Design a protein around this ligand. Structure first.
Ligand SMILES: CCCCCCCCCc1cc(=O)c2ccccc2[nH]1
Ligand SMILES: CCCCCCCCCc1cc(=O)c2ccccc2[nH]1
Lengths: 203, 203
């Protein structure tokens, strides 16, 4: 029955919050994980027959789907704690566009404004694990969700650069793309209401 | 000396917060108001010789300028309290793309993804006052900053539709575009630090 796709930028908590709720109302629920760079591409494939996507990625008006927002979540631009650009911010926060960035690659090779890399050179990868191996290494810098990075962060293995750009990490909305058929379906509305109401915390 | 441009979506408080601070460090400070639809166009004109823009509008990498974020602020999609789409949300929240929208026109006729109208027909205007005359009228619906609308809102003259899309109004970042020359200038940094630190409230 209900197939829902969850990108990797979504905290793995925001995912049990969901799944608990949908089983009340639904009797078969499949959960698919996906690069954020591939989320929206995927739901456009009709055969893939997704009914709900949870992503950070944005695009206005899609084919058969509607959009709304569930919450907010944070990402950081990170590097090795002696990457040149470490320390020395504001000026160097503009020089990111010169340094090598480790970006999430997409299947379609295409990117949204939101996820397109800011610099060159870019070195593409499949997911945030590969990304951090590399910035820990540390060739390049990257933007990764909080949940990934906070482990290493307090451990001093990685440092943040995002801070003078946006203190507190880069606030980023979490969207919900849902097949229009679910608009005003007593059950979907419960999921929305309940997912949101919960997803204040973590925050 | 210092010329700073402030779009109309910026609360008129976020504007005294700024202006107080800059006079400590600056001795001539001009403040220009602008449609958000025209903010960025304007700072690209070189003759206009703007040193700092405060806008909700977004564009990545501009000519001589850097970007960072000062805070957050809210906007609502509003209409006449017996506009068809009133009441009846979620489905109708998708039918906005069919109803007439009152959008902020731009000089260049061009719009960013962020400000481009969602529907047609569109009926362009110069500013948020014209916009509300019209949605109060009420031909069409529009998106307007909180500060404008909260007056009329509790007064029942206008109703919100944004709520199932994004409860609490549509969170929207407030960017700072500052000429690169000001990067690491003891004074600019004070302004940033102090503007931000204050602009938590209102919120
Ligand atoms: C200091 C440089 C700021 C440039 C960042 C531009 C805004 C962030 C957009 C964004 C890009 C991502 O790759 C991303 C990845 C995971 C989660 C949020 C993200 N936000
Ligand atoms: C319920 C329909 C949601 C569609 C709104 C799309 C996100 C809002 C982007 C935006 C458009 C504006 O015109 C605007 C104007 C002033 C302040 C913030 C704004 N945000």
């Amino acid at each position: 029955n209900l197939r829902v796709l969850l990108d990797t930028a979504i905290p793995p908590s925001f995912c049990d919050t969901v799944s608990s709720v949908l089983l009340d109302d639904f009797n078969m629920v499949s959960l698919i994980r996906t690069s954020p760079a591939d989320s929206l591409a995927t739901i456009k494939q009709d055969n893939a027959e997704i009914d709900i996507a949870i992503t950070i990625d944005e695009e206005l008006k899609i084919s058969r789907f509607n959009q709304c927002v569930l919450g907010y979540t944070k990402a950081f631009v990170v590097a090795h704690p002696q990457h040149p650009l470490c320390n020395a911010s504001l000026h160097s926060i503009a020089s990111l566009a010169n340094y090598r960035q480790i970006s999430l690659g997409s299947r379609s090779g295409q990117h949204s404004n939101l996820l397109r890399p800011v610099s060159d050179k870019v070195l593409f990868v499949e997911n945030f694990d590969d990304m951090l191996r590399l910035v820990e290494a540390g060739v390049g810098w990257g933007i990764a969700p909080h949940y990934f990075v906070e482990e290493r962060l307090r451990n001093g293995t990685l440092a943040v650069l995002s801070e003078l750009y946006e203190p507190g990490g880069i606030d980023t909305k979490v969207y919900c793309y849902y097949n229009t058929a679910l608009e005003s379906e007593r059950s979907f509305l419960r999921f929305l209401e309940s997912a949101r109401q919960r997803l204040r915390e973590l925050g």
